[PDB]
Symmetry: C4
Subunit: 274 residues, 4 copies
């Protein structure tokens, strides 16, 4: 019957969560992942659906997401376990026609529910749909170790943080020319932190939560994972450099300007001006 476990999107959710677990980014339940699907992705699996899908209201109306299906990670669930029991740890949800709530079509067994960061995820999907004319389809949150560490030692400022990350690996300006947004510390699992994240997502594909972690957005699971992996790689390099006493030389303004010109990207002005 096909079997939705072996669908591209369940397999992709398993790969991304497992890979993030192996990176050391997702201790316990600390990360969450949502992927926007099309009806055509799930329609062939209608017989895999729960016969009697559960309904859960959204935190607030989200009419831009009306009729939209997603695959999501569950609240309190461990990225390490996704590969062991996808239907326990993931769910397929479909937002209803008013954007007021969703049905759980598959997964989230034994009364599990979507991630407690659903506001941050779905509100950010709304802003990224608008910002990218529908190209972006993934919001990923993880507890990326070196990025977290840097939030205790670098100025928590979009321009400063972006410039240091650009400097810490040549590809970074090309991968995230729009830079990294950073919020004040905020209480997690709230619609305040969720819309604050979504507002930053209007201008950046990466958003940092000081003393907590990162959110990224992109068109595909691999592109979004790779975005975060790039930023975290640069952060890893920076932690080493700072631990050795700091940069004696680095990528100059530009050199960053030449890089952006070659790759046809416009670097965030404030980060470049530093």
């Amino acid at each position: 019957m096909q079997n939705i476990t072996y669908s591209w999107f369940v397999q992709g959710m398993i790969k991304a969560t497992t890979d993030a677990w192996l990176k050391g980014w997702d201790e316990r339940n600390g990360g969450n992942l949502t992927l926007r699907l099309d009806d055509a992705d799930i329609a062939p699996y209608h017989d895999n659906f729960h016969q009697q899908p559960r309904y859960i209201p959204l935190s607030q109306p989200m009419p831009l997401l009306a009729n939209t299906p997603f695959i999501v990670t569950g609240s309190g669930k461990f990225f390490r376990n996704v590969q062991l029991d996808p239907a326990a740890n993931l769910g397929i949800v479909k937002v209803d026609s008013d954007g007021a709530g969703y049905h759980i079509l598959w997964g989230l067994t034994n009364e599990a529910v979507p991630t407690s960061e659903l506001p941050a995820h779905f509100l950010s999907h709304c802003e990224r749909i608008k910002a990218t004319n529908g190209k972006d389809r993934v919001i990923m949150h993880c507890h990326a170790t070196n990025l977290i560490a840097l939030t205790y030692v670098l100025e928590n400022d979009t321009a400063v943080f972006t410039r240091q990350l650009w400097e810490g690996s040549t590809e970074c300006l090309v991968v995230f020319p729009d830079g990294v947004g950073i919020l004040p510390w905020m209480v997690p699992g709230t619609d305040a932190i969720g819309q604050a994240t979504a507002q930053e997502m209007q201008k950046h594909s990466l958003v940092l939560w000081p003393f907590h972690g990162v959110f990224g957005s992109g068109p595909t699971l691999d592109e979004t994972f790779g975005l975060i992996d790039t930023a975290e790689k640069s952060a890893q390099v920076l932690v080493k450099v700072y631990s050795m006493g700091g940069m004696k030389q680095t990528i100059s303004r530009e050199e960053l300007i030449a890089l952006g010109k070659r790759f046809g990207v416009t670097p965030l002005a404030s980060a470049l001006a530093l």
Copy 2:
């Protein structure tokens, strides 16, 4: 015949020990793990039992554990090897009706015996049963690298250590609001260190052994592993931050207070007051 190797609890012991080995927490024989079971868990496997179960006395009477079965790791056994030969490296034991000793029903082949830290494990199970009205079922000890390193550089004080761990990842206050107990250095494998650990377990779900490692307690293998993983993740972040010259900003008192209110936990007063 079912085959107890494929039981949830043998498989779970394999997963936790293997995962801890991969983390770098359990060189050689350095860690131990005990899980309290119910008779109903093991009864279906009676035919897998040793036909003639061995009897070993406990170090002291433990009448609260009368008639209680456990699955345990063996003395001198390596976490790395559990997956290769579960019955060599694990045993199922059942404490007798007086709490004076136990029978080895399965495993611990070739005259192996339970971990030399059995006092610390079983005495801590007794105190956690009382403290949690029977909810906690696991005691896990590992040589968590960054937590160990921090015991050489942070004040070995419950309030100080707890506050720094809370600061080193936002989730920590929510995961361990009761904080981390820390003992003086003590000679391992003794009932002194075992009851000292058990006494700390009355007030905390995590206990540090300076220059040695950590003990954690929780209701399930994953929750207990995840508790330790959380604390060790924060410790990893802290080691990076301290190596870069220390915190320039951090989570404030709260912010910790707001966090606790949102998640309905009461943070350890002494750690909050700092």
Copy 3:
């Protein structure tokens, strides 16, 4: 029909890219790998070829590579994915009789193309063929973490950098007696950086791209991987030592001289003279 996926060279490309992914050297699309084959390697797989091979021009004429087949990684492709879909992420190309372009005989499906660093790869293959009388067959680029970090803190000078790497593990002088060439930072994906790399390859088997990564050359995939792994291992040791305040003792001039004599290698004079 044999099946070229299971050929030694496809399997070897999978092993090297996967191993480099596991090392943390190849986030996103950040690395590339090319291996020079003989017609006799691919001829048994003619029926696996695309029936209608695509043609792509080279950036400039490369007549030394006329009629030469290679297996290559694709542009924008992830080392992590090579094992999952070799034909999506790798291609077999054969340079035409004038050295002006190549046909894609196998792989690079869905209009993928070879790595954007093809100039650096193929121009370096030309110079290594000349320098080694045809022995070298591999060019590997990765984002080797510790080597990258060191480019922010060590003088970006061939003699200085080579000497520190020699000091950081005893084998290094024996593995790379010719030292490590290092370029100025340059914009990637250009023929300028490609021939600059190729010129350094005339004199060294390793070339560093500051703030970016490393290129290595060797006769086989394992020897080339092992060359880079050796340099990166030494770099890892050095990052630790520098983070602990620097060397209190080290390998002397040599001792390096005695080492070279025993193993019959001539160490780079400028690095030795320091």
Copy 4:
């Protein structure tokens, strides 16, 4: 026919080399491993032997090893590859009746030969046979990262180095009460470094090669691996502590004395006296 690949000793050599590769201790060909067998181990596999075993002389007479079989890693071979092709990368050798040379009974295909550190291995086996009344059976060399790093920053002195390693994890005094011998830097692959190593092995189960790596001896593969893993774990902890500015508190003289008394070991006097 049984198949010697699946013998306990070939499987054990695969496990130890693979595990050491995963630890990051054995880049390229950098490590070597030898295990002393009994005739009874190999006799059941006589039909797996090369029909016409090769003979190679030893570097010097070793009559204590007369008629003794070993399984060994090959010169220039990679620990990473042992699992992929055991017979290419390992050999079974049997020393002849005069101790003058050995026959390659199995493995070391395509004219491979035993490790270039065979003097250090076999001479150390001789001294450990005498020191342990035949109990020790394994000599393992690896490029243990943190131990290497410490040789640039700690005094290369047996007492000093041993005491710091004892301090860096509580188990270390119990695992290696005889301490760690350390040689001056010496040119590798020589009988000078081999007997110098063997002489240190008279008094210690671990020997450090500054700026290079470690040798360990023990009765079984797991015990020897675990010995090295323990020392390297402590070294890892120490590198973190030193990078954070050094110890503010540590294990006292003890405390070390009490530890040794409890576990019935006599700690190396010179290290204790510090």
